[PDB]
């Protein structure tokens, strides 16, 4: 077993890489922006699985539980990563080092602007809360472990409580009062509902783009998109 700080350090060293994606030479259209975002999401999915496999005890879960968790979480984790990358650039969404989308740029894709304003809104809240790096690591691991409600069951609840105690430990290290610690903890996990909402809306939006044949989902992204 691991200590709360050891779990945090383990999460740190498991951090997935920043997938590089460049803007097309031609100005953005609906078909090409959806192409860029899905290509980015399809590449990030690969690194996410290796990230989840490095969370302590995750591979001890049954294969059914590992699969079910990643299907439910993948859009949330990806959205939470995009938001951490964008936390210091208000008005911009840092999808990739060379793919910085200004808010008004989403007008070319049908209906993506609402999800852009959602992602930016929650990012600004994480910004005003001054989300620390170690808190972001716990929050991301909590997103995966808290995604679906349904021996491997006992390990899952132990897994969620360990990350939660790690987050409580990280907040306790900050030195603020015990009442400020409870308030900070509450303010952080209240945004989990906003992230799940952005995930639900983005999930529905991408399913329409795939249904209208606007974007071609391929391999990993296609496998997850089913359901």
């Amino acid at each position: 077993a691991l200590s709360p700080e050891q779990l945090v350090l383990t999460l740190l060293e498991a951090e997935p890489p920043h997938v590089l994606i460049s803007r097309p030479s031609a100005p953005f259209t609906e078909a090409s922006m959806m192409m860029s975002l899905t290509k980015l999401a399809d590449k990030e999915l690969v690194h996410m699985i290796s990230w989840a496999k490095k969370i302590p005890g995750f591979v001890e879960l049954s294969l059914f539980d590992q699969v079910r968790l990643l299907e439910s979480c993948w859009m949330e984790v990806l959205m939470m990563g995009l938001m951490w990358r964008s936390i210091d650039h208000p008005g911009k969404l840092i999808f990739a080092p060379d793919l910085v989308l200004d808010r008004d740029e989403g007008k070319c894709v049908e209906g993506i602007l609402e999800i852009f304003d959602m992602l930016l809104a929650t990012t600004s809240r994480f910004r005003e809360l001054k989300l620390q790096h170690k808190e972001y690591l716990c929050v991301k691991a909590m997103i995966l472990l808290n995604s679906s409600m349904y021996d491997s069951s006992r390990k899952l609840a132990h897994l969620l409580n360990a990350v939660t105690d790690a987050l409580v430990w990280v907040i306790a290290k900050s030195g603020i009062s015990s009442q400020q610690q409870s308030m900070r903890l509450a303010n952080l996990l209240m945004l989990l509902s906003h992230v799940r909402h952005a995930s639900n809306k983005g999930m529905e939006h991408l399913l329409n783009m795939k249904c209208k044949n606007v974007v071609p989902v391929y391999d990993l992204l296609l496998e997850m998109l089913n359901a």
Partner: peptide, 11 residues
């Protein structure tokens, strides 16, 4: 889930 299962079982 061909790809997801394979990526979960390897190293």
């Amino acid at each position: 889930h061909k790809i997801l299962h394979r990526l979960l079982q390897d190293s």
